[PDB]
Write a protein that holds these residues in place. Sequence first.
Motif, PDB file in Angstrom:
ATOM      1  N   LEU A   7       0.803  -1.231   0.000  1.00 14.95           N
ATOM      2  CA  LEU A   7       0.000   0.000   0.000  1.00 14.95           C
ATOM      3  C   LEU A   7       0.844   1.295   0.000  1.00 14.95           C
ATOM      4  O   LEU A   7       0.313   2.397  -0.011  1.00 14.95           O
ATOM      5  N   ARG A   8       2.156   1.162   0.009  1.00 14.39           N
ATOM      6  CA  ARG A   8       3.047   2.337   0.050  1.00 14.39           C
ATOM      7  C   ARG A   8       2.685   3.332  -1.052  1.00 14.39           C
ATOM      8  O   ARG A   8       2.270   2.930  -2.151  1.00 14.39           O
ATOM      9  N   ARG A   9       2.853   4.627  -0.769  1.00 17.46           N
ATOM     10  CA  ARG A   9       2.331   5.638  -1.687  1.00 17.46           C
ATOM     11  C   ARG A   9       2.918   5.574  -3.082  1.00 17.46           C
ATOM     12  O   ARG A   9       2.237   5.949  -4.028  1.00 17.46           O
ATOM     13  N   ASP A  10       4.149   5.088  -3.213  1.00 20.12           N
ATOM     14  CA  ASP A  10       4.800   5.035  -4.516  1.00 20.12           C
ATOM     15  C   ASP A  10       4.278   3.917  -5.405  1.00 20.12           C
ATOM     16  O   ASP A  10       4.617   3.853  -6.599  1.00 20.12           O
ATOM     17  N   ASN A  11       3.447   3.023  -4.856  1.00 14.11           N
ATOM     18  CA  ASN A  11       2.897   1.958  -5.672  1.00 14.11           C
ATOM     19  C   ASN A  11       1.752   2.468  -6.511  1.00 14.11           C
ATOM     20  O   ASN A  11       0.639   2.587  -6.046  1.00 14.11           O
ATOM     21  N   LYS A  12       2.050   2.770  -7.770  1.00 12.23           N
ATOM     22  CA  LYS A  12       1.047   3.209  -8.751  1.00 12.23           C
ATOM     23  C   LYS A  12       0.223   2.048  -9.356  1.00 12.23           C
ATOM     24  O   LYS A  12      -0.817   2.291 -10.008  1.00 12.23           O
ATOM     25  N   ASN A  13       0.668   0.800  -9.141  1.00 10.11           N
ATOM     26  CA  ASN A  13       0.014  -0.391  -9.727  1.00 10.11           C
ATOM     27  C   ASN A  13      -1.037  -0.984  -8.796  1.00 10.11           C
ATOM     28  O   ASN A  13      -1.141  -2.225  -8.619  1.00 10.11           O
ATOM     29  N   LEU A  14      -1.791  -0.105  -8.168  1.00  8.52           N
ATOM     30  CA  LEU A  14      -2.804  -0.521  -7.219  1.00  8.52           C
ATOM     31  C   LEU A  14      -3.973   0.413  -7.316  1.00  8.52           C
ATOM     32  O   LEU A  14      -3.814   1.617  -7.185  1.00  8.52           O
ATOM     33  N   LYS A  15      -5.151  -0.161  -7.543  1.00  9.16           N
ATOM     34  CA  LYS A  15      -6.391   0.561  -7.487  1.00  9.16           C
ATOM     35  C   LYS A  15      -6.679   0.899  -6.037  1.00  9.16           C
ATOM     36  O   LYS A  15      -6.757   0.015  -5.187  1.00  9.16           O
ATOM     37  N   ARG A  16      -6.815   2.188  -5.766  1.00 12.17           N
ATOM     38  CA  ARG A  16      -7.118   2.661  -4.422  1.00 12.17           C
ATOM     39  C   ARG A  16      -8.632   2.757  -4.229  1.00 12.17           C
ATOM     40  O   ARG A  16      -9.386   3.087  -5.157  1.00 12.17           O
ATOM     41  N   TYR A  17      -9.071   2.457  -3.006  1.00 15.97           N
ATOM     42  CA  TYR A  17     -10.494   2.515  -2.642  1.00 15.97           C
ATOM     43  C   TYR A  17     -10.686   3.107  -1.247  1.00 15.97           C
ATOM     44  O   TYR A  17      -9.777   3.085  -0.425  1.00 15.97           O
ATOM     45  N   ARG A  18     -11.888   3.609  -0.998  1.00 18.74           N
ATOM     46  CA  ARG A  18     -12.326   4.085   0.298  1.00 18.74           C
ATOM     47  C   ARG A  18     -13.782   3.664   0.464  1.00 18.74           C
ATOM     48  O   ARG A  18     -14.644   4.060  -0.332  1.00 18.74           O
ATOM     49  N   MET A  19     -14.074   2.887   1.505  1.00 23.29           N
ATOM     50  CA  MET A  19     -15.445   2.636   1.898  1.00 23.29           C
ATOM     51  C   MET A  19     -16.070   3.904   2.481  1.00 23.29           C
ATOM     52  O   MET A  19     -15.428   4.671   3.186  1.00 23.29           O
ATOM     53  N   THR A  20     -17.354   4.104   2.232  1.00 25.41           N
ATOM     54  CA  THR A  20     -18.029   5.242   2.828  1.00 25.41           C
ATOM     55  C   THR A  20     -18.299   4.957   4.299  1.00 25.41           C
ATOM     56  O   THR A  20     -18.351   3.793   4.711  1.00 25.41           O
ATOM     57  N   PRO A  21     -18.487   5.999   5.113  1.00 24.06           N
ATOM     58  CA  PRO A  21     -18.822   5.764   6.531  1.00 24.06           C
ATOM     59  C   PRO A  21     -20.051   4.867   6.713  1.00 24.06           C
ATOM     60  O   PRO A  21     -20.062   4.010   7.585  1.00 24.06           O
ATOM     61  N   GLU A  22     -21.074   5.040   5.888  1.00 21.56           N
ATOM     62  CA  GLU A  22     -22.269   4.193   5.984  1.00 21.56           C
ATOM     63  C   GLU A  22     -21.941   2.743   5.657  1.00 21.56           C
ATOM     64  O   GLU A  22     -22.451   1.845   6.302  1.00 21.56           O
ATOM     65  N   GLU A  23     -21.125   2.505   4.636  1.00 18.28           N
ATOM     66  CA  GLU A  23     -20.720   1.153   4.266  1.00 18.28           C
ATOM     67  C   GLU A  23     -19.953   0.500   5.406  1.00 18.28           C
ATOM     68  O   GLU A  23     -20.126  -0.684   5.680  1.00 18.28           O
ATOM     69  N   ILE A  24     -19.086   1.257   6.058  1.00 15.90           N
ATOM     70  CA  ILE A  24     -18.253   0.690   7.132  1.00 15.90           C
ATOM     71  C   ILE A  24     -19.151   0.327   8.305  1.00 15.90           C
ATOM     72  O   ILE A  24     -19.041  -0.770   8.851  1.00 15.90           O
TER      73      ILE A  24
END
Length: 347
Positions: A72-89
Amino acid sequence: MTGREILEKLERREFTREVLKEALSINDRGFNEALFKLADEIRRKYVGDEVHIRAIIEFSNVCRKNCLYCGLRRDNKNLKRYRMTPEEIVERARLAVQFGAKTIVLQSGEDPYXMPDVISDIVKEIKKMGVAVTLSLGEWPREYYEKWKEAGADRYLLRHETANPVLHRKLRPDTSFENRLNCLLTLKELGYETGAGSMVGLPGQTIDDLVDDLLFLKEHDFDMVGIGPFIPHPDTPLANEKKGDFTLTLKMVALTRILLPDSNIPATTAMGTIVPGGREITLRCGANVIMPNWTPSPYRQLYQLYPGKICVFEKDTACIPCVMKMIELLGRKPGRDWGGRKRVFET
Ligand SMILES: Nc1ncnc2c1ncn2[C@@H]1O[C@H](CSCC[C@H](N)C(=O)O)[C@@H](O)[C@H]1O
Ligand code: SF4
Ligand SMILES: [Cl-]
Ligand SMILES: [Cl-]
Ligand SMILES: [Cl-]
Ligand SMILES: [S]
């Protein structure tokens, strides 16, 4: 000393650097099996047969840090980033509680978006469900930790990673062992049940470093200790380094139980990733906690600290039932309460 004499000193609790170093250096099968039996017996005696289930929701893989080992290190461009919404969590947590989880673990990359107020809101909603909440969000200001404690969080996991400050700084270039320790000390002062722990088989880590990890854990008397092998990730600078050894990591778990008999110690997913059935082995060598994956699709597969993680192809709700079966086939029992540390004061 001979294996037999090291065991005798461990049984008498002569936890010297010399005893720990020899325990980790001896590769004799008979010795190792005796060490594992000792840890298993200490676990049974002090923390019993209950295996505590902590449902883990990996709610964001966004990270501002650049740890060399981590996918997950910031320099890894070969990764789709995601964020769950507060309601989903919150609703995902609720589903876990419906499935019988007594602790919800919220873990993420160090993702600024939620910090501190969105986390506080989420924690408050989950605490209404009558379960323990554990956070594992990395390093943040004291004020954030204070807010999260006031919001109702019970526990915080912040592995120390490595107690060698030089190795720590090289592997975690945004920060330091000194900061990591100050964070752990702050968490304890604020009244969290606090978890530390380390990776085994990091590039450049020595047996003496592992001894130092053990002594550090004993010194600070942590409530929880998470230990697993280093697993190289192809999109990181450590891609071509060797994986941590399962048996050596297992010895670290066993010795941790012997040193900290009343602590909560998970059988980590990394242990199950490097050896099929590794978690089950670890539960029989000193561990008493398991953390089934509760991250939903399509996000579960994107939280790739290391590659090949087990649980990735199973259904959203499979892992709690899986570990309940596991607990039963191990001849163990699920935890009946929140599974907080039950200290046994001694000499
Ligand atoms: N490549 C890898 N192999 C094995 N474990 C790893 C790993 N990358 C990360 N981990 C482990 O996963 C844990 C969770 S990292 C997520 C939480 C938070 N960002 C934090 O850093 O504390 C880390 O503490 C680390 O010990
Ligand atoms: S270990 Fe934690 S802080 Fe470091 S890169 Fe991975 S997710 Fe970010
Ligand atoms: Cl926890
Ligand atoms: Cl952990
Ligand atoms: Cl892990
Ligand atoms: S799973």
